[model samples]
Target chain A: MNIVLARIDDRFIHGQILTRWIKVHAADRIIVVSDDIAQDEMRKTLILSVAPSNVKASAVSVSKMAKAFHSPRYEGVTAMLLFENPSDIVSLIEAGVPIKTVNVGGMRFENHRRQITKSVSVTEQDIKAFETLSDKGVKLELRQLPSDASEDFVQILRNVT
Target chain B: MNIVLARIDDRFIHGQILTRWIKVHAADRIIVVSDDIAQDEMRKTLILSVAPSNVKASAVSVSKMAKAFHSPRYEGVTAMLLFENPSDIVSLIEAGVPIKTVNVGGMRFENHRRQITKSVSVTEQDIKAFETLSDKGVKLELRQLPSDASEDFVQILRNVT
Candidate 1:
């Protein structure tokens, strides 16, 4: 699979994703992995509607994403994978999906989560998973749009921890 | 006093905000009101850093915002007021700040909250406050970016309810 970009963003498809990331990555398909979103037909429909007409899009559960990732049909499709949290990315990576790098696009504010950056808030679990991913050689970069300088998220985790 | 625009967004300040909303509002100053943000010095400094060199920016508590709104020093300041939630907007309005309209730019998702738009996810309390604000003749419009068409947030609430 030609996975051009894999992003962990709560707002999976929106202004930045549509206007900036999609073009920068030159992505043809966007696969959103979220168990809750898979069950949410309304949100799924909204996501599909926002996708550029020239591109393809689908929202599926984590398990289904892994299945698609390993399947032969996924080959040759240039795709952008999006997730809401670190745990799901962990699930995909642990299940042997070949996502070598991840862009920490957006993680919204939560009460207990440490607000590492303006767009990112993470819990203890999230920090640990990010550390594990970093150790596993999966580069994580924090960036909002293509134009912004990529901040090494591994270093960010080091400072936060 | 000539108030520029009032916006409610959980992310508060970031990419689209720096590139789009600031210009769209034609704002010379930005006033961010949220009890949490006022206490968060790190977040306050980060937000202040993002504002354009030409614009003045301040993050204040709800009560402090009310004081700033009523004070003579507030006169002639073309400022855009930013809030994290609908309840705070209600607080400002109830405190006698004459905000005739509010732009619902972005409200991130949360468990059990309904996703009204790609950028807005609201709980029951938020819905009630929005309803109350609408009932009191405050226009609530949802527009994520200046390029997108504005959706009537009050009409959306009425349909949802």
Candidate 2:
């Protein structure tokens, strides 16, 4: 499988992914890797509804996505993979999905989360997941849109958390 | 003032607008016309925070936006105007904001609202407001992103409601 973008955005499928990132990355397919979203029928339906007419989109469990990535059935497919959190990406990597770079996008503020960038905030669990990805040689960067300058997410994680 | 695009989305400033639409329209500034959003301090701050670093974004009342549009202070400004509902657009048009076209992007499903399109749902009040704009010769078309083919919202409104 040819992965165009592997991004972590709390809002899994949104305007940015549908409009900007899809075109910039030249992704013909979008796979939302999240156990939570896959199990919820309503959420899955809502997400699939927003996908562009020309592109194929699906919501799958992290394990399922990892299997699909490894399968020859998906060979040469240009896919954009979206995850809601870093832990899921770590799981995919551990399951032998070769994601070399990860784009750290929107992680909106919650009660215990500390704000790292304007669009990103994280909890202790999130920081640990980032550390795991970093140790495994994955390049993590922060960029909300294609035009915005990329920032070193690991560096920001060091300073903020 | 040169208005690049005028859109109606319940989600005022989101990933799509900040990442995709901003570049597509070449909008230097974004004016969110809504009485409810302008008065709510928390919502205003959250909306402004998501705007792309280069572009100026503000949430103002319909009347205030009309005033700004008519004022000499904003001459030669390239702006993307966003509204939550069609009623606000009608109000702006009546107040002399020369918005020739309106892009109906999103109006999420809610109680008592009928779904016209996947992203857009409308109440009777919404339908009436749309009719008001139609009567004024405002071109109301629906397209979630730049790539999608534009659909005549009025025709859909007639068929659905």
Candidate 3:
């Protein structure tokens, strides 16, 4: 499958994605890679409830969606990939998913979380995930919209560490 | 609904739970509570696939299950509540789900985590969760099997912090 864009936002499938990223990338389809929502009927329905007109969207677990990276059916399809965490990005890549650059749109602040940016607050696992993704040659960029200038996220993560 | 037992283990459903807790509690039903697992389809299916014969099992987000805690259908169901982390237990209690004793079965060690016990580890968030649960009068017990001696986890958390 052709991944036109890949972004990380803890709250996957939000207004930022629907309004800006899809159009900028000219995405025909969207894949939300999250294991947490796939089983919960209420959240899954709510997440998949909003899909752009004429553009299909599906939420699959990290393991199931990882196979799509190497699948021929997804090849040539202009798809926008979304993950809730950096670990998921690392997961797909380790499973042979080719992603060039990852846009860090958001990671909400929580108790005991470190501020990666105003919009991104991460725990130890998140920092580890970002570091792992960087080591694998994935360009981690911090920006929300296509119009915004992207900042190198790896450096930000390193600065915090 | 009557809560037969509540246990915290990162791996929500496993051989230990399936073979031991299920029978020991004489649970008629199982409720896997975690917002993380609720969204992921792979782990959800994997956890649900191994339900013992004649026992009903369903996975629900912490919010969803917490509501079920006071729901009518669950009122009569003898349910064993399973959670993947300490935070969820606090969430449930905060949402008004009555949980008295929480069995801390396992939480695997990770980078930047302190060992709470041989099989359990604590992060900052975990310690916070444990404290919240303790303050709210929820008993946290550390035990794997019915035969094992249960230790008060709140004290263990205190010793580390």
Candidate 4:
């Protein structure tokens, strides 16, 4: 099955996500793969509650999904991965999970995040993630929602070096 | 009064948007200001007919909307401008339409487009628009959807210049 998309938004699921993103992608399955969101039952429940009823919203650890993906249980379901930080994405890639592309969703300005957009931002750690995934042949993108603009990490950086 | 967000995706007004963006942004009125879609009656109808009935969706020409925004006609509407070409956005900016940020959505591979993401590419013309907007202090970003990650053009360009 095709990976609908993968995003890295710190808030995980919020307003622009609930009303705009869900409908724009027509995603039937929304998998939130944050190890932290999985533990914080309150946060997990809150996000799941907010997700559109049609899209299956669940929190799973990176490794768990990797093993589960190959299992007979998850045969034909289309998957979309959402992570909180760069490391979350790293874990999934390390777990040998295959993805053709990755979407960077959430990285709020904290330590080094330079403001990129009004609602979203990224920093050096975020760029490193792009290089990492790109090395793996994963087409990394920065798209807040399905209807937003898209840019290639590699291409945007192409003329640099 | 805030620019709830600026996104770039081909699949606009889909499920993710309905549940994620609207619920989070709480935008009472949804305005899609696009000259391309607004100018075409059939595409306008298609976009207008696609959204959920609860939220109000209006497609207006960029120049017309810029003028309308000043009048009482645009009272309290959170606007989302959609353009097939970057010049459309550039035109709005040239028209002195004060958008907080500009989003680069799906720029497919035309004869001269530089492929950046999956079937998403930016041509020289697109680059010219971005260069102009970036030069003008506009927050230009590449977003796939509303809830996805944001890429910083300036910081990323730091690697370039």
Query: Candidate 1 chain B, which ten residues in sequence have the lowest lDDT sum?
Result: B47-56
Which candidate ranks first by DockQ, i.e. highest? 3
Candidate 3 lDDT, tens digit per residue, B49-129? 545657788899988987887888767888898888889888888788889798889988877888878989878898888
TM per candidate: 0.50, 0.51, 0.53, 0.45
Give the per-residue lDDT digits (tens) of candidate 2, residues A1-161: 99978998887667754468888878767778888887888887676656664555677777878777877646687998888899999988878888989999889998888888898888889889999999999999989888889999888889864
How many clashes (backbone atoms < 3 Å, residues ≥3 apart in a chain or on different chains) does model 1 have?
0
| 2 or 3, greater by lDDT | 2
Output the better candidate (1/4) by DockQ: 1
| Residue B143 accuracy (lDDT) in model 1 | 86
Alpha-carbon local distance difference test for all models:
0.78, 0.82, 0.78, 0.65
lDDT of 4 by residue, A106-140 (tens): 56665555665554466677667667877877787
Each predicted complex: what DockQ?
A: 0.03, 0.01, 0.03, 0.01
Tell me the TM-score for chain B of model 3. Answer: 0.92
Tens-digit lDDT string for candidate 4 (B1-161): 33465545555676555446667767644556676776687876687556653455666676765675575524565645455666677787677667678666566566765666553566667667767777777897765656679766545434432
RMSD of 4: 21.4
Q: Judging by lDDT, tell me the better candidate of 3 and 4.
A: 3
